[PDB]
């Protein structure tokens, strides 16, 4: 198989 996770959070 192949999986690909990504995650991104920015906060001011």
């Known amino acids: 198989k192949f999986f690909e996770a990504a995650a991104?959070?920015?906060f001011e």
């Open 8 to 10: 991104k959070k920015f």
